[PDB]
Every structure is written in structure tokens, then in C-alpha cells.
């Protein structure tokens, strides 16, 4: 039996709105951390159970509010969520991978007593928009410790990361910041083999479809941590032979689904 599932047994439907879990929200003041600029962190209450945890980060000039729908979404499902700000919101994404690191370690170490209480410190990933997408995959690089990343709409002058932390990678059609041509496709294609890997492309979406409540991306962010972070093989059926109208591309190595 697995001592790390959550929730009820899961319908698509379901994944499309808040989940089971009641969400409480501390802010994380600037001045009050160290390697990172703050944020909010999501996590559930009334409840006794604990939760893995994940650290996510905005895009290039973007606030952790551009993320909110989607740190308090995790939450709701059973996750402890901080939605980073960085230190300057001109950061770029190297910078925003050593800020998600430090925001790691924090969460792990020094969060508020009732943070400590609901997460599993052992069971840890990552997300982000954008340059916190490049970001996301620079971590992922430099922890193999991680569960899993989600970059959405990812950005990086650099195309090739070297890890082997499962990721799924949202790509938005006719994202003209981070095209996925030059960004997302590349990044699905140069990480290892090896690597379990999701490539999702949105149809007919912008660049900004991650800063709003969206089906799609909830459906597989969720679904990709439930995998991973909780070893919740329930999720394995949202991620494996999917036709989904909301996708123009659905791309895969298949490890995850055995």
C-alpha cells in the first residue's frame, strides 16, 4: 500500500477545479529570506496528514501573484506550494533556478511552524512560467534529487539539460516570447533519452495561457506531481494515451506509464 495518496479517486473533472483540500496561505515577506525574494506559500489545512512540497517560479517581470490560481490548484490537491517573487523581478532564469533552490531549502528548514506541520520534507519539485520555466529545468539539472519538474512556456538561451528528474514540459502553439519552436520543442527533445519526459502543446494559446485557470495545464501539472511526488499511479491515466482537444501536440517517452 502506498503511504503517500491523497484524495479520492480522481476524474478529469475533478482536476479542472480546486481539489479536496482546504488551502491556507502565509506570505513570505522579502526581507524575512534569504535567496529569494519571498512569495506565497499554499498549502492545506484542516487536515493531519503531510504533503510533498513544491517550489514554483514566475516569468520574467511577473510577480508570484501571475501564479496564484495555480499554486493555490497544487494546494488544494494536496501539495505544500510556494509561489516564489525573485530577488529583482528582472532576474533571468539561472538566477530564478538558484532562487527555486533556496526557496527548496526554506521550505525544508525555516517555513512557519504550520507549513513544517504538512510537508514531507523527503518528497520536493519544481515549476514555473517563462524564465522560471528555464529556471525549473537549470534545478532540475543541478538536484537528480527532485520528484519531478513543470516547465510552462519555458524560456532559456540554453537549450540541453543534463537530468534525469521527470519532466513535463507545457508549450503554448503561438507563444511568441518563448516560441516553442526555439524554446519548449528544443528542451523536450535535447533532454536525455532516459529522462521520462511530456511534451503538451497548447492549442491556439499565448504565452500568458499559465497565468490564468486553465484546464489543461491543471489537469497535467497535477497529474504529473500526483506521479511523482506521491508515487500516485491514479494519475498514470491522464498522462498515458491521452487524446485531450485542448492539445495540438502530445509528445512522449512513455517511461511513466509502466
Same mark, same amino acid.
Given at each position: 500500500?502506498?503511504?503517500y495518496?491523497?484524495?479520492?479517486?480522481?476524474?478529469?473533472?475533478?482536476?479542472?477545479?480546486?481539489?479536496?483540500? /482546504? *488551502?491556507?496561505?502565509?506570505? *513570505?515577506?522579502?526581507l524575512?529570506?534569504?535567496?529569494?525574494?519571498?512569495? *506565497?506559500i499554499?498549502?492545506?489545512?484542516?487536515?493531519?496528514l503531510?504533503?510533498?512540497?513544491?517550489?514554483?517560479?514566475?516569468?520574467?517581470?511577473?510577480?508570484?501573484?501571475?501564479?496564484?490560481?495555480?499554486g493555490?490548484?497544487?494546494?488544494?490537491?494536496?501539495?505544500?506550494?510556494?509561489?516564489?517573487?525573485?530577488?529583482?523581478?528582472?532576474?533571468?532564469?539561472?538566477?530564478?533556478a538558484?532562487?527555486?533552490?533556496?526557496?527548496?531549502?526554506?521550505?525544508?528548514?525555516?517555513?512557519?511552524?504550520?507549513?513544517?506541520?504538512?510537508?514531507?520534507?523527503?518528497?520536493?519539485?519544481?515549476?514555473?512560467?517563462?524564465?522560471?520555466?528555464?529556471?525549473?529545468?537549470?534545478?532540475?539539472?543541478?538536484?537528480?534529487?527532485?520528484?519531478?519538474?513543470?516547465?510552462?512556456?519555458?524560456?532559456?538561451?540554453?537549450?540541453?539539460?543534463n537530468? /534525469?528528474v521527470?519532466?513535463?514540459?507545457?508549450?503554448?502553439?503561438?507563444?511568441? *516570447?518563448?516560441?516553442?519552436?526555439?524554446?519548449?520543442?528544443?528542451?523536450?527533445?535535447?533532454?536525455?533519452?532516459?529522462?521520462?519526459?511530456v511534451?503538451?502543446?497548447?492549442?491556439?494559446?499565448?504565452h500568458?495561457?499559465?497565468? /490564468?485557470?486553465?484546464?489543461?495545464? /491543471?489537469?497535467?501539472?497535477?497529474?504529473?506531481?500526483?506521479?511523482?511526488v506521491?508515487?500516485?499511479?491514479?494519475?498514470?491515466?491522464?498522462?498515458?494515451?491521452?487524446?485531450?482537444?485542448?492539445?495540438?501536440?502530445?509528445?512522449?517517452?512513455?517511461r511513466?506509464?509502466?
Open positions: 500500500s502506498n503511504p495518496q491523497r484524495g479520492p479517486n480522481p476524474t478529469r473533472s475533478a482536476l479542472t477545479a480546486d481539489g479536496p483540500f /482546504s *488551502v491556507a496561505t502565509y506570505t *513570505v515577506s522579502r524575512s529570506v534569504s535567496g529569494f525574494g519571498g512569495g *506565497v499554499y498549502y492545506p489545512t484542516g487536515t493531519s503531510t504533503f510533498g512540497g513544491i517550489a514554483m517560479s514566475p516569468g520574467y517581470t511577473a510577480d508570484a501573484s501571475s501564479l496564484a490560481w495555480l493555490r490548484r497544487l494546494a488544494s490537491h494536496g501539495f505544500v506550494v510556494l509561489v516564489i517573487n525573485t530577488n529583482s523581478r528582472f532576474d533571468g532564469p539561472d538566477s530564478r538558484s532562487q527555486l533552490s533556496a526557496a527548496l531549502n526554506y521550505l525544508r528548514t525555516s517555513s512557519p511552524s504550520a507549513v513544517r506541520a504538512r510537508l514531507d520534507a523527503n518528497r520536493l519539485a519544481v515549476a514555473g512560467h517563462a524564465m522560471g520555466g528555464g529556471g525549473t529545468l537549470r534545478i532540475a539539472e543541478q538536484n537528480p534529487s527532485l520528484k519531478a519538474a513543470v516547465p510552462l512556456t519555458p524560456w532559456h538561451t540554453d537549450k540541453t539539460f537530468t /534525469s521527470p519532466v513535463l514540459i507545457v508549450g503554448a502553439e503561438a507563444d511568441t *516570447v518563448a516560441p516553442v519552436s526555439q524554446h519548449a520543442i528544443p528542451f523536450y527533445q535535447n533532454l536525455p533519452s532516459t529522462t521520462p519526459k511534451y503538451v502543446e497548447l492549442c491556439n494559446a499565448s500568458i495561457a499559465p497565468n /490564468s485557470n486553465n484546464a489543461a495545464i /491543471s489537469v497535467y501539472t497535477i497529474s504529473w506531481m500526483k506521479l511523482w506521491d508515487n500516485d499511479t491514479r494519475y498514470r491515466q491522464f498522462l498515458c494515451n491521452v487524446n485531450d482537444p485542448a492539445l495540438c501536440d502530445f509528445r512522449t517517452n512513455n511513466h506509464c509502466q
